[PDB]
Amino acid sequence: QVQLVESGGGLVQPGGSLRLSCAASGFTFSSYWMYWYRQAPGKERELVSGISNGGAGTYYADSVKGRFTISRDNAKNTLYLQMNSLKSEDTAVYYCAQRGSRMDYWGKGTQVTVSS
Ligand SMILES: [Cl-]
């Protein structure tokens, strides 16, 4: 069975950093683009970042460019999101996802709270 498990969330002050990890299981990880999404309870789901099969291509929401960096380890089957220069607006549940090559797969999410 496919499973995605996010970790690395927490409570930090504006300007601080976190690193999210997404431990993937139960599929051929390196055959897929992998993604981070987020949702703040008041708001709609938003794509945060994506990374190509082997990592040469990346995509970022304009609002996270220069702050967040997506990367992956195709042997450890782990996706990462380095989050620097955190802002209040970044407070959200963060979810990793595989969106196929037609099934979608989602983790249960990790809470990031940016607050003084
Ligand atoms: Cl928290």
Q: Give the distance (Å) from ligand 1 centre to CA of residue 50.
A: 23
Residue matched to tokens 């996802």 = 97
The CA-based dihedral angle spanning residues 26, 30, 32, 37, taken in that order and rounded to the nearest 10 degrees:
80
Q: How far apart are CA 20 and CA 49, in angstroms?
A: 12
Q: Give the distance (Å) from ligand 1 centre to CA of residue 92.
A: 9
User: Residue 101: exposed, middle, or buried by beta-carbon count in 10 A (0-12, 13-18, 19+)?
Assistant: exposed
Method: X-ray
Q: What Å resolution does this PDB entry report? A: 1.6
**Running DSSP on this structure, what letter comes out for residue 67?**
T
Q: Report all structural domains of the chain as residue ranges with CATH numbers, in order of start.
A: 3-114 (2.60.40.10)
Distances from the Cα of 11 to the Cα of 7, 39, 42, 51, angstroms: 13, 16, 18, 26
